[PDB]
Amino acid sequence: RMKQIEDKIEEIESKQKKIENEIARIKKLLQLTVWGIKQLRARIL
């Protein structure tokens, strides 16, 4: 039963790592969209 719990924890940890990786990618893209809106407003208006 302990091994079953340990395996489930490993699975949750692995997925948490994937989620953290996704979040960093989202943050980077979000920063690029901020840049684009800022560049648009400045270059046009």
Place this chain on the structure above:
Amino acid sequence: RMKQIEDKIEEIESKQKKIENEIARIKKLLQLTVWGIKQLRARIL
């Protein structure tokens, strides 16, 4: 004590599923904002 650990794991798993769902929604909206910035720049500039 094992049941207490198993219940906590279930709670963490449930919340992880909610987080994954939120992340997909964020990604989709982020893709729409990219589209909007791209469409703006192309249609105007």
Place this chain on the structure above:
Amino acid sequence: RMKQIEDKIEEIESKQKKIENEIARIKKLLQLTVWGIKQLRARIL
């Protein structure tokens, strides 16, 4: 061994809380970028 499992669960929970916090911040910034694209399109076009 139970304490080791309980400590790992605490670590995963702590990181899950940080992730939830990050997600809320991403959502708020994403809402601001939506506002900016909407304001741009309306003010210009």
